């Protein structure tokens, strides 16, 4: 029994060990209470404005659309405190944790941006934070490990499995199943068991709300499409949510194609996996013929995850949103292009969204289209990875 619908069509649910159901119900009740609480909303708004720096800019590209009929705006979540959109909903969930009388935080992280967000919110709001991170990600996103630890968070490398995001997720959930009486599990994406896909959407939806207001101010109309990368789905559903009922606005989500879909080394379950049950949810996943969960791959740690949030699977199934993929090399080209022609260093995650927008433009350069890309994070965490690659390719 729940207050809110745990499903998006066939997808979603609460597929966790029985021991954790009361924690999930408690979280749902606290969220529903907080959403109607003017004092909670005021506190959340104040943190977003005066601490995190909202609203974020909407930047018109000056150079990369030259010679085409594409107008491109970037929603600048890279300018948020912490360096990514992750900070929005962590501030909200941290307030929920306090509301429920919890003093400890468990989080998982891949790119380290949710880890950094969790750590900074815990420092601000007086919570004890421990963060699981795959050992491969500890290496390729090292600047964020340093940032988390400087802010007093405990960072726990995970060496099992692929030593990436799904493995950090597993450990976080295992931890929570024994520590939920005192710890809140601050899940970092729009996935997992109900109520997390709903809470994460509602605490990220200011991205699309602001975007709509900003594009109406600057262009006097809605975008032809909004484009976002999709790991678990939080920055994309955050951008999408306020446009879902604007039927003329395209919603485009970009999964990581890794080395190419044909190689099987990717993170694109929505279009190339099949429905399964894992990480507390019924959702598309990368799985073997027998139903073992497959390891994903992406150059970007934040997209390196073998499933996807259930609301995206639903929006796809009814045709309201379209999903595509972008390979490592396509993302790297977009990264370089934004650096050199707009002076913005994007996260490699965000570079997948930008790459698809550039493709929409280049493939049909006389097509009139007004596009917004969600620039979900800055690329400081990625600059050593990208440098090593370019060097090992001449450049």
């Amino acid at each position: 029994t729940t207050l809110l619908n745990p499903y998006f069509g066939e997808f979603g649910g609460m597929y966790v060990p029985q021991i954790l159901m009361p924690a999930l119900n408690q979280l749902e009740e606290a969220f529903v209470s907080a959403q109607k609480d003017p004092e909670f909303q005021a506190q959340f708004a104040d943190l977003l404005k005066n601490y995190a720096g909202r609203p974020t800019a909407l930047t018109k590209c000056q150079n990369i659309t030259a010679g085409t009929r594409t107008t491109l705006y970037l929603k600048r979540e890279d300018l948020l405190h912490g360096g990514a959109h992750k900070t929005n909903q962590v501030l909200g969930q941290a307030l929920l944790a306090k509301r429920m009388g919890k003093s400890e935080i468990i989080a998982e992280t891949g790119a380290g941006q949710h880890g950094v967000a969790s750590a900074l919110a815990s420092a601000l709001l007086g919570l004890k934070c421990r963060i699981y991170m795959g050992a491969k990600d500890v290496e390729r996103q090292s600047p964020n490990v340093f940032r988390m630890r400087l802010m007093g968070a405990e960072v726990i490398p995970v060496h099992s499995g692929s030593a990436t995001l799904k493995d950090a997720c597993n450990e976080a959930l295992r931890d929570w199943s024994g520590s939920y009486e005192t710890a809140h599990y601050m899940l970092g994406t729009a996935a997992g068991p109900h109520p997390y896909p709903t809470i994460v959407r509602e605490f990220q939806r200011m991205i699309g709300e602001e975007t709509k207001a900003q594009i109406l101010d600057k262009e006097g109309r809605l975008p032809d499409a909004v484009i976002a990368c999709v790991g678990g789905g939080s920055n994309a559903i955050g951008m999408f949510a306020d446009f879902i009922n604007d039927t003329s606005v395209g919603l485009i989500g970009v999964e990581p194609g890794g080395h190419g879909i044909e190689t099987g080394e990717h993170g694109a379950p929505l279009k190339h996996g099949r429905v399964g049950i894992y990480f507390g949810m019924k959702a598309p996943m990368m799985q073997t013929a027998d139903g073992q969960i497959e390891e994903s791959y992406s150059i970007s740690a934040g997209l390196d995850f073998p499933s996807v949030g259930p609301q995206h699977a639903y929006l796809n199934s009814i045709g309201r949103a379209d999903y595509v993929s972008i390979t490592d090399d396509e993302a790297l080209e977009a990264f370089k292009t934004l650096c050199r022609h707009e002076g913005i260093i994007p996260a490699l995650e965000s570079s997948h969204a930008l790459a698809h927008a550039l493709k929409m433009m280049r493939e049909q350069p006389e097509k009139e289209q007004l596009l917004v890309v969600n620039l979900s994070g800055r690329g400081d965490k990625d600059i050593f990875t990208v440098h090593d690659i370019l060097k090992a390719r001449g450049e």
Partner: protein, 264 residues
Amino acid sequence: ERYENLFAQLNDRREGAFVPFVTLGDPGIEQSLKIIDTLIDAGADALELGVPFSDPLADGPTIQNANLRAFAAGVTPAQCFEMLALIREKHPTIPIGLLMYANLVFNNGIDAFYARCEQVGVDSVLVADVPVEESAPFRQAALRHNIAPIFICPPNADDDLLRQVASYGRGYTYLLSRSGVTGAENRGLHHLIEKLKEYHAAPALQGFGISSPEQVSAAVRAGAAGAISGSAIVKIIEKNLASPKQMLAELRSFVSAMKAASRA
């Protein structure tokens, strides 16, 4: 009716059950079959058997590593069902329960999974990441194929949950000792036991962190029908990988001692 018959026999002898858990195919198919025959010969009243899964979220490192050993030996669910057929062919009355994760059951059809269980002679299935709230198609398929669906009673179960578990479950009720995941190193209630009896639930087996005879005796004295031990058993396997005969001897001593404690 294998659980029903077992518990009736145990009750007439004023006895509790001892039920070991192992992972099917750990450390290899042949050695796993010998391990299981040793458990039974040493006095196991029933078995709980894991099918290796890539991401076992209710399990701690000991059983995580059991799954990995089985995968290193190339064990698949198909091979597990082959093993199950062989075990049942040898042992016609011992209740056999499977520990499953949802995706392995859901994968290519829930009904088809429970049908395969019935054909090889499995008696119960516990799906670890399906709570009662999500259980309808699983327990329906289970009952259609004469399989007992097993449900969990956690230490802080409210009355509604107690009533649901009593009504939906068959075979036995899993009485969780504590929160957390499986693990010997982490050791773990009369009110729950009495309430389950009041609601005519299947008999309760206590599990999680039971690694000593004293804990088994305490479970039965508190009114549980018996106890389950997994990690303690698996540790003996892990410790003796290079010494297969010493492995079986230590398994036999441990299981015999745990079973003796169930008579308290």
